Design a protein around this nucleic acid. Structure first.
Lengths: 99, 146, 217, 45, 119, 192
RNA sequence: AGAGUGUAGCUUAAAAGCACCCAACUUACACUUAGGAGAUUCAAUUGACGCUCUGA
């Protein structure tokens, strides 16, 4: 039975008069729009680098698989199939300070 | 008409396979199709948990757009309820009083269906390289009831 | 048909710290925290400032500051662990803790009779045994310690051609859990090396084309 | 590559304030955590 | 003249003497005026160097507003001032098409073609 | 009793196997673009375009006019790149574009439209009205030189004849003011 | 050293159409809206710049 926790609590209704004030200027909005434009171009650059690395790595692996298929008729049958060593695979994330 | 050369020109349901079956309580899992020369894994789970909520949501959005871009199918994406953990603080001088502070924990899940083994290893390493700050990844199996 | 049976492997190492942040991303995190402040509403600390000082002026007409100064003191007593374990060494290329922002690949030295090669560690597979099994077998030989290199797949990585009697080079990769390195003063010149230093250390075409399938970060 | 998913906005509509506390784990390792009540160091035993 | 009445289940309806038709590429915005037999009469597109040099960001809203003004001028010089605009709902709620229809009406060109006589 | 088709069936080129690894139409306008693209093709069954009076249009039509004047498109493309790069240098243009307030000099784009692509537009307007159908029995041309004829009624205004305008015969009472560019070696025949 | 060559990622496109990226809506995807960056390697159809395969 699923338990949902995207419900905002019922205390979140009443005290709704703390920050409705948004009073900005023109220089801040043009700064924010220019920064969003810069960040859009930057993220397109990162995605392009990521795609080129994925495609080059894939053609490298396929070149290796083709040469193994040419040079050895038995090792591809064991080489393609995935061994059960990586069934409960996991990896914990990076840190900020060393031990 | 049935005898004309243009018979069956308006055929459409041989293009749409979706039978609209009961896709809420069905548990007909796809299995690992393994031919040795053709290994193909099934309906493996991906878990992303963190104490921060917005980091888990952002990385789930990242991995969803990533596997969508690489044409490997998303089965379902959903979230577990949160857990909350107390750091019951022992007092420094007189350690018999236990004060308390609050902390939280969220979790997000995506599912992938089509995995050849080469794309499996390249997929897991490319998620693992772009793994963000603070979360932990765990590629688990399918029988995970809530 | 004589094919001289030769594999290889490349050691994979996870980074420990995130890479430092770019200045446009600093401005983006600043404005993201700004938009966060604008759309936020009714924290407990916000009332514990505002209506606490309001009721303070109220009963003066008849907390927050102390605890936040305490939190400044709790920051200042704990100096965090310094990320720079890199410039204080500046020399130890053989150490696991030299570089932590990036990923690193290990490479061993043995000058042969005919050949003279700085090698990313090889494997010599036997026709009774499998390829990845010989990869972890030579990994047990070449390292002379206890390490847990979790492999990533049964599929090989990169194939190259040297013939003198034909031969071939079959690559593998494996992610490291923890390196418990015994005999750190080894004279078999293994070296923990990043991508830029990988491109530095390689002379040949056999090692130049390796960099296309290591993670460039 | 760990700069791709670190730039985030709290995407729920109604939400409180959060502060970048520096959380130290069981080996002395820092994580930026968006946590309220602007503490500066959180020691998880 | 008789309009092509009918078709009654498909979209767009073929009941017009002239239609307004706008094509929104990811690079350019182009507006056409067609007769119902299929031959176009006037068009204003940002692929043309004349509209290209005088504005910035040919995709955006003010480019479509300029396309509306230039097309309204070009079709008043063509003697055609009744046409039908038949959009999808999400295009009709878009700000770009709103300001393009505003530029067409403020240019003097009126939509909603009159009735046929003895229809 | 069946009969085989006289050509390819329309949805036959896609493969019915591996359906879940195909790309679907995620929208309505994508299908709309594909369907109105497909409705222009010469199909072999019976269609709407065959019956409803399209005059049997496929046949090449004779050009009788001036040739196009030769331009070097490489230099023109690089100079236009230079011009839009010079306009993209200004920052108040970016403020006007973001702030939804940036108009166009309609007279300048009018004269430039008369200069560059206007002859082809006037050609298709002249073919829509049936001028080439009734003046030269189908033989077409392009109005290479621009022309300006304006009518005279009152004191200040004008009533010009552009391509396809409407002018009342009271405004056409006297001879109009005809002007165009010409060199001092050319003779012309006007005809109304 | 030889050979094939040549428009941004693709195109029996000729400066285009799809692809692609950011913001808003959605748990998320997807739709939609509002923005972003993009190319003919040069020299007079011929010649010397980059890549790919074969070499050593």
């Amino acid at each position: 039975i699923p338990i949902e926790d995207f419900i905002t609590p019922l205390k979140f209704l009443d005290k709704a008069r703390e920050r409705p004030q948004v009073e900005l200027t023109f220089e801040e909005t043009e700064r924010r729009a220019l920064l969003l434009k810069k960040w859009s171009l930057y993220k397109q650059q990162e995605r392009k680098m990521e795609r080129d690395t994925i495609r080059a790595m894939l053609e490298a692996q396929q070149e290796a698989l083709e040469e193994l298929q040419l040079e050895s008729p038995k090792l591809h049958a064991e080489a393609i199939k995935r061994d059960p060593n990586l069934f409960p695979f996991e990896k914990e994330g990076p840190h900020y300070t060393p031990p | 008409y049935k005898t004309k050369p243009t018979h069956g020109i308006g055929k459409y349901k041989h293009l749409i396979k979706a039978e609209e079956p009961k896709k809420k309580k069905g548990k007909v899992e796809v299995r690992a199709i393994n031919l040795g020369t053709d290994y193909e894994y099934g309906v493996l789970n991906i878990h992303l948990t963190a104490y921060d909520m917005t980091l888990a949501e952002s990385y789930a959005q990242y991995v969803h757009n990533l596997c969508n871009s690489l044409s490997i199918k998303v089965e379902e994406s959903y979230a577990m309820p949160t857990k909350t953990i107390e750091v019951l603080q022992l007092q420094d001088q007189g350690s018999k009083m236990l004060l308390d502070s609050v902390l939280t924990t969220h979790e997000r899940v995506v599912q992938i269906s089509g995995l050849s083994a080469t794309f499996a290893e390249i997929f897991l390493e490319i998620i693992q390289s772009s793994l963000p700050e603070g979360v932990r990844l765990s590629v688990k199996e399918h029988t995970e009831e809530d | 048909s004589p094919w001289r049976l030769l594999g290889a492997l490349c050691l994979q190492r996870p980074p420990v710290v995130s890479k430092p942040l770019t200045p446009l991303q600093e401005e983006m995190a600043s404005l993201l925290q700004q938009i966060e402040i604008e759309r936020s509403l009714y924290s407990d600390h916000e009332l514990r400032a505002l209506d606490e000082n309001q009721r303070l002026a109220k009963k003066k007409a008849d907390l927050a500051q102390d605890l936040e100064d305490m939190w400044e003191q709790k920051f200042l007593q704990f100096k965090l662990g310094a990320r720079i374990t890199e410039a204080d060494e500046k020399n130890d290329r053989t150490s696991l803790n030299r570089k932590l922002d990036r990923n690193l690949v290990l490479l061993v030295r043995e000058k042969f009779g005919d050949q003279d090669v700085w090698i990313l560690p090889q494997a010599e597979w036997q026709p009774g045994e499998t390829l990845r099994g010989t990869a972890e077998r030579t990994l047990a030989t070449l390292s002379e310690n206890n390490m847990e290199a979790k492999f990533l797949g049964n599929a090989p990585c990169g194939h190259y051609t040297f013939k003198f009697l034909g031969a071939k080079v079959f690559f593998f990769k494996a992610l490291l859990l923890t390196g418990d390195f015994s005999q750190a003063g080894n004279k078999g010149h293994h070296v923990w090396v990043t991508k830029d230093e990988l491109g530095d250390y390689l002379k040949p075409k056999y090692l130049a084309q390796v960099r296309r399938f290591v993670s460039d970060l | 590559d760990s700069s791709r998913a670190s730039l985030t906005r709290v995407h729920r509509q109604a939400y409180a304030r959060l502060y970048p506390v520096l959380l130290v784990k069981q080996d002395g390792s820092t994580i930026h955590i968006r946590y309220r009540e602007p503490r500066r160091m959180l020691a998880m035993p | 003249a008789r309009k092509e009445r009918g078709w009654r289940t498909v979209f767009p309806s073929r009941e017009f003497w002239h239609r307004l038709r706008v094509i929104r590429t990811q690079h350019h915005v182009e507006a056409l005026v067609e007769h119902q037999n299929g031959k176009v009469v006037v068009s204003a597109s940002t692929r043309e160097w004349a509209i290209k040099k005088h504005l910035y960001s040919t995709r955006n809203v003010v480019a479509c507003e300029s396309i509306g003004r230039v097309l309204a001028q070009r079709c008043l010089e063509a003697g055609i001032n009744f046409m039908v605009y038949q959009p999808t709902p999400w295009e009709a709620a878009s700000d770009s098409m709103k300001r393009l229809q505003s530029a067409m009406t403020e240019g003097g060109v009126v939509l909603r073609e009159p009735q046929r006589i003895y229809e | 009793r069946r009969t085989p088709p006289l050509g390819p069936m329309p949805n036959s080129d896609i493969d019915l196997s591996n359906l879940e690894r195909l790309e679907k139409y995620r929208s309505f306008d994508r299908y709309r673009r594909r369907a109105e693209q497909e409705a222009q093709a010469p199909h072999w069954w019976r269609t709407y375009r065959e019956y409803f009076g399209e005059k049997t249009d496929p046949k090449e039509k004779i050009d009788i006019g001036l040739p196009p004047p030769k331009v070097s498109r490489t230099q023109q493309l690089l100079e236009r790149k230079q011009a839009i790069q010079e306009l993209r240098a200004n920052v108040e243009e970016e403020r006007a574009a973001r702030l939804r307030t940036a108009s166009v000099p309609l007279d300048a784009v009018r004269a430039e439209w008369e200069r560059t692509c206007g002859p082809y537009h006037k050609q298709r307007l002249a073919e829509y009205y049936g001028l080439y159908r009734d003046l030269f029995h189908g033989a077409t041309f392009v109005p290479r030189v621009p022309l300006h004829v304006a009518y005279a009624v009152g004191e200040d205004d004008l009533m010009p004849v552009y391509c396809g305008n409407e002018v009342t015969p009271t405004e056409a009472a006297q001879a109009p003011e005809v002007t165009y560019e010409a060199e001092e070696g050319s003779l012309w025949t006007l005809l109304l």
